[PDB]
Amino acid sequence: MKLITAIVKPFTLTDIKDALEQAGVQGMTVTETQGFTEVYRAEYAVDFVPKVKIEVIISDAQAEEVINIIVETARTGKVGDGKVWMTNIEELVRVRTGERGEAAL
Amino acid sequence: MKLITAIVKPFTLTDIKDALEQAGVQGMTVTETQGFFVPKVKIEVIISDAQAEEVINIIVETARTGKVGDGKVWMTNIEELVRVRTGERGEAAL
Amino acid sequence: MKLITAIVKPFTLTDIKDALEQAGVQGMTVTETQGFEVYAVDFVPKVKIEVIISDAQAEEVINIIVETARTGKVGDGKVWMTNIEELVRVRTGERGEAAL
Amino acid sequence: MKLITAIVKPFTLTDIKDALEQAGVQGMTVTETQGFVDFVPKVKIEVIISDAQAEEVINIIVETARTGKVGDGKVWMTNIEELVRVRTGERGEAAL
Amino acid sequence: MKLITAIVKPFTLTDIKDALEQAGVQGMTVTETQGFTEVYRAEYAVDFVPKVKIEVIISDAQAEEVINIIVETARTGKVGDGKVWMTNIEELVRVRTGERGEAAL
Amino acid sequence: MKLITAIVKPFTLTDIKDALEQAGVQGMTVTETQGFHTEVYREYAVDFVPKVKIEVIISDAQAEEVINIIVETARTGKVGDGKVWMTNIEELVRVRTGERGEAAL
Ligand SMILES: Nc1ncnc2c1ncn2[C@@H]1O[C@H](COP(=O)(O)OP(=O)(O)O)[C@@H](O)[C@H]1O
Ligand SMILES: Nc1ncnc2c1ncn2[C@@H]1O[C@H](COP(=O)(O)O)[C@@H](O)[C@H]1O
Ligand SMILES: *P(=O)(O)OC[C@H]1O[C@@H](n2cnc3c(N)ncnc32)[C@@H](O)[C@@H]1O
Ligand SMILES: *P(=O)(O)OC[C@H]1O[C@@H](n2cnc3c(N)ncnc32)[C@@H](O)[C@@H]1O
Ligand SMILES: *P(=O)(O)OC[C@H]1O[C@@H](n2cnc3c(N)ncnc32)[C@@H](O)[C@@H]1O
């Protein structure tokens, strides 16, 4: 099992969700986040850029496809398009049923 | 060391916190999120290898309503852990 | 490739950003989060900072964040490392070190 | 027209919404807020209502948000001098 | 002096900001908010509709024009388009200078 | 009764709260909000500036004092220091007791 995490521009969220759903990939968690001076006495960084974090739990066999869908859909060519990364999931449980591993995907 | 992450219904949060505290599990970070809007909370716990499966079972059994939307719980390996205040590492940082 | 995640007090944020930037490390993500009546009342505002980093720089980045986020008082938080199995730059599709 | 604003404990939100719905009042907006390095989460509820119904709406929110302990919050009324429904361009009472 | 408040769909936000700018109106505030069941131990509304609250401080002379710009720019013709309202401002202060009234706009 | 609303830089919040407390003014609600290049994606503003909205319900007799405390504390002299404004409160109720008006302050 893999976790795919993507930090992307907020206005791409709808397009990413639709592209995954047409690939049969449903299930996604979205969190608002920020990437990147003024003195007030300390120093404060003043300008933030809004992003969304998209998290998809996925089978090993579909991990690469999900990455490519998000990359291709989130891309605008301009700078700040963001990053996608993969981490390993060692255990997975569906709360409702208690199914584990593949059965929980 | 393991990271336990759960996406659960917001109204289960206090019950999960209480269930974990009686198991001696202290630290917990809580982030508002949403999924497929439906508001959820992400709960994250850093736990020893020996207690990690117990923590998963506590969260699963306490977050369960039997209805759709109950969420998922997963485990990620932690390769290094440092407690900021002391600089202790590994098991000593837990 | 490594992900460094830290839960720290909100007022350390600029000091951490500057200290990372000083070490040539850019690109951090910041998320508001929190730690800890019948019908929990109090919450403690925290920030989660995440930094994608090469294996060669991972320990240095951990050390910068730990030293920069420390107050000596309870609640200072924790810093941890997870392994990244694939990194992609959205703009180019580049992987690995070319995506840093 | 009146704006009714209330700062209330988050777990009373659905009960207030249902009590207002039974009174025929629809269209509330809900914003996370916090009040008084340690905050207590509250929700701000805002309702736009006719002059004739405004005091009833205050009573519903007060009675449904009350727990009898500290933190129950406050409810207040602001005068609305003009109101427009975006979809139709209706104004005043027709926008309610 | 007036406060104009509007609850509108989030994708109209840039169009509204642009139309206000074209009219020489700047200084809007934007707040994420929600419009509108599961029982647990009791009742809980299950889902929400994302909205944005927009607030603009405006002279009396320009208040109707600003209302009309926001209404025409936020409109889609679909349900959920929101509402725009005006409240009276009894004192306005610019923090930097302490200037009141028209000097604070 | 009056409502004092202030849009100020987030790093001034603690100093404003302490200044209001040492003046005997208790009770405040704080909301995260944003003020305002342009990116096209098919038009989207991207650079947001974080602010906090502070709201204080106050008696008529202390309204001016509260405005001046917030203004003087939130001021840094730089641009973006924000604005403070006053609106009239026609009715006020303390939820816990049902006290009204002055008794609810
Ligand atoms: N594959 C996934 N990846 C990331 N998050 C997920 C995934 N599946 C579910 N979630 C999270 O868990 C919550 C509950 O999911 P689930 O119960 O499967 O949703 P539904 O009620 O639509 O069946 C979702 O709101 C989502 O945030
Ligand atoms: N004077 C005030 N101005 C603004 N908000 C207030 C005021 N008094 C109370 N509140 C809000 O109501 C919440 C509950 O306060 P209380 O009911 O007085 O314990 C606070 O945390 C604030 O969010
Ligand atoms: P477009 O289809 O007009 O917008 C779709 C979604 O994009 C988000 N979003 C709106 N406005 C911004 C801005 N200024 N910056 C980042 N993301 C934005 C959602 O709010 C909107 O529904
Ligand atoms: P119960 O004691 O009422 O739950 C308390 C907590 O539940 C969360 N929550 C409240 N209301 C909702 C709704 N409508 N939807 C999802 N989660 C909810 C917290 O807000 C509250 O503190
Ligand atoms: P200072 O006393 O270091 O911080 C006080 C509070 O100000 C907020 N804040 C922290 N960091 C920022 C930045 N970069 N920009 C705006 N506001 C900031 C709180 O987070 C902090 O506790």
Numbering used by the authors:
A (entry chain E), E (entry chain A): 1 to 36, 43 to 47, 49 to 112
B (entry chain F): 1 to 36, 55 to 112
C (entry chain D): 1 to 36, 44 to 46, 52 to 112
D (entry chain C): 1 to 36, 53 to 112
F (entry chain B): 1 to 36, 42 to 47, 50 to 112
The authors write:
PII proteins are ubiquitous signaling proteins that are involved in the regulation of the nitrogen/carbon balance in bacteria, archaea, and some plants and algae. The allosteric signal that links effector binding to the regulation of the activity of PII-interacting proteins is primarily transduced via the T-loop, which adopts different conformations depending on the nature and combination of bound effectors.
Hence, only a single AMP moiety was modeled per two Tyr51 residues at each special position, namely the moiety that displayed the most easily interpretable electron density. This observation suggests that in the crystal, at any given point in time three adenylylated tyrosine residues are able to adopt defined conformations, while the other three residues are forced to adopt flexible conformations. In both the AMP- and ADP-binding sites, the adenine nucleobase is bound via two hydrogen bonds to the backbone of Ile64 from strand β3 and via one hydrogen bond to the side chain of Thr29 displayed from strand β2. Of the six T-loops present in the six PII monomers in the asymmetric unit of the adGlnK crystals, a considerably higher number of T-loop residues could be modeled in those loops in which the adenylylated Tyr51 residues are clearly resolved, and a considerably lower number of T-loop residues are visible in the two monomers where the effector-binding site is occupied by either AMP or ADP. In addition, the presence or absence of ligands, whether it be phosphate ions, AMP or ADP, appears to have little effect on the conformation of the T-loop in the present structures. This also holds true for the adenylylation of Tyr51, which also does not appear to affect the conformation of the T-loop. Interestingly, in both adenylylated GlnK and uridylylated GlnB, post-translational modification of the PII protein does not engender defined conformational rearrangements in the respective PII protein, hinting that complex formation is not modulated by an allosteric mechanism but that rather direct atomic interactions between the adenylylated Tyr51 of adGlnK and AmtR as well as between the uridylylated Tyr51 of GlnB and ATase promote complex formation.
